[PDB]
Write a protein that binds this ligand. Structure first.
Ligand code: NSR
Ligand code: NSR
Lengths: 304, 304
């Protein structure tokens, strides 16, 4: 029992982290096989970031300008290329610690673990969600660029995020491992609208099921609702509309607790309309949306 | 910017996890050098747990009865001994992945990372605090026993906790790596009073400083207080009395923000007396006590 904001064990990713320096800029890189992946803004000075022409900036750089260090050992760079907003530095040595891996583009509302790094060294790991507006509320300081987000299924690390930028609002933006930004963001020091965010309804419902499994049941009521009625309330409270696909994903948790999804929706409706009344659910005084139904089943079943 | 419940990178600890089986019971062990550490209740059947005489139960066991497996490879056990509530299984091979390590007994109110494991395999990592009542609010299922808590300072892992038991109340109890329980707990299936818990005042103040550093300042007021006045309020709200040692530990955060510790105490006093009024601090609708002043400075400075 107990329910925590649990991250995946970071060991497989720690073995991939390297430092990349270009000129006066240093950030993190991800070394998989014989390629080092890093944010393309490593080639920029602070002045270049206002309106960078990355193609022109990269032309002034050669293999020997990218200093890649894995721990205390230097890697020899034999090729470089830009793919969207990432640089791919071909090295002469395959990382002996490369785990089984995949590059995936996650959907908004899904979760992942972040291994925050500085100078190629891991500092910490935390779990988070990709917001419906394609930002992440991470914990990142200057030098954290190139730190990655990932999920692990048995021995396979699915890399989904590479950190690039902190918006003036304090939220974070980044790319998939092919260098494509999540959201409308561009790698430039210019104010950028993140756009309206919403609460991940399916995740709040998953977390209410986690609460029931772990003993917190005070919010269960004698009511039910329909998808249409629930969605009128979701609209009012800036929650994502619940769909039958979301109900279907919640099936395993509904079977485990015996609480029909629409009955749990009615509990969520009452909580949205009345608040918590000074009470807590799983140690939180607000409705948590950073656990997917898969996360709840995994944490409550002990998948390794 | 951003502030998360960040755990230490778990890689160094992942390399130490093994499975230990004795008879029909399987749990996790920690392999450091040529010794495997695990909870002594591995020698018990479910029936034995009501009132176990561990000395007698261990006498019926020989080296060959403890099956230790690191991944898919079996370790040869050449010695066994009980130290308090842990078993130390001497193996013929030193763990090649042993990090630099220390065994430490943490104080109540300090924090640490937990690598939850099942069958010697890591499932997740999370951060938590040792409660003032010596319990931890973890996330542990059956088979998680032997999972460890730790802190990391550069290359040294300081192991502080080994998981042993879940109390009927859903909270967790365990030992230091010398097998001494934190708190009054005994390794027996008997109802056990955890005793009154309190809120870790110095940690809430540290987290309020983290909030100010990360932009959340709405709770700052025009007031100040004294240690005596603040402690009258702390008494009423079941908070630990604040001492000059706590004020001294908060020095670095007071210097970083320019907010005197007693002025931050007055903000905490107002929050305790008035509540949050539907507002949030660092994404939380309650006062967080699981970040120490050291955690706040580390996370806000990027120590690797
Ligand atoms: O955001 C950036 N770095 C950081 C990333 N995450 C957390 C940070 C916290 C504090 C300071 C810097 C942080 C860089 C520097 C600013 O100009 C830009 C503009 C665009 C891009 Cl892609 C990156 C950057
Ligand atoms: O608590 C124990 N195991 C667990 C530990 N953590 C989370 C659990 C969640 C669900 C079921 C078991 C869990 C064992 C089994 C019960 O009897 C005892 C009594 C004493 C001791 Cl030291 C251990 C144990």
């Amino acid at each position: 029992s107990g329910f925590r904001k649990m991250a995946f064990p970071s060991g497989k990713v720690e073995g991939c982290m390297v430092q990349v320096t270009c000129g006066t800029t240093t950030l993190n890189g991800l070394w998989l096989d014989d390629v080092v992946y890093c944010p393309r803004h490593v080639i920029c000075t602070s002045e270049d970031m206002l309106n960078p022409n990355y193609e022109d900036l990269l032309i002034r750089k050669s293999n020997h300008n990218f200093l890649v260090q894995a721990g205390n050992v230097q890697l020899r760079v034999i090729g470089h290329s830009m793919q969207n907003c990432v640089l791919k530095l071909k090295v002469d040595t395959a990382n002996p610690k490369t785990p089984k891996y995949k590059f995936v583009r996650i959907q908004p509302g899904q979760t992942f673990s972040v291994l925050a790094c500085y100078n190629g060294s891991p500092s910490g790991v935390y779990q988070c969600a990709m917001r419906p507006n394609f930002t992440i509320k991470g914990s990142f300081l200057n030098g954290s660029c190139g730190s990655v987000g990932f999920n692990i299924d048995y021995d396979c690390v699915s890399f989904c995020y590479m950190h690039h930028m902190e918006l003036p609002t304090g939220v974070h933006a980044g790319t998939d491992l092919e260098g494509n930004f999540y959201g409308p963001f561009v790698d430039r020091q210019t104010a950028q609208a993140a756009g309206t965010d919403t609460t991940i309804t399916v995740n709040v419902l998953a977390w209410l099921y986690a609460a029931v499994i772990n003993g917190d049941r005070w919010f269960l009521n004698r009511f039910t609702t329909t998808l249409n009625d629930f969605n009128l309330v979701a609209m009012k409270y800036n929650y994502e509309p619940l769909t039958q696909d979301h109900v279907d994903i919640l099936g395993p948790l509904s079977a485990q607790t015996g609480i029909a999804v629409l009955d749990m929706c009615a509990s969520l409706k009452e909580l949205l309309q009345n608040g918590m009344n000074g009470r807590t659910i799983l140690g939180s005084a607000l409705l948590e949306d950073e656990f997917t139904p898969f996360d709840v089943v995994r944490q409550c079943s002990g998948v390794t």
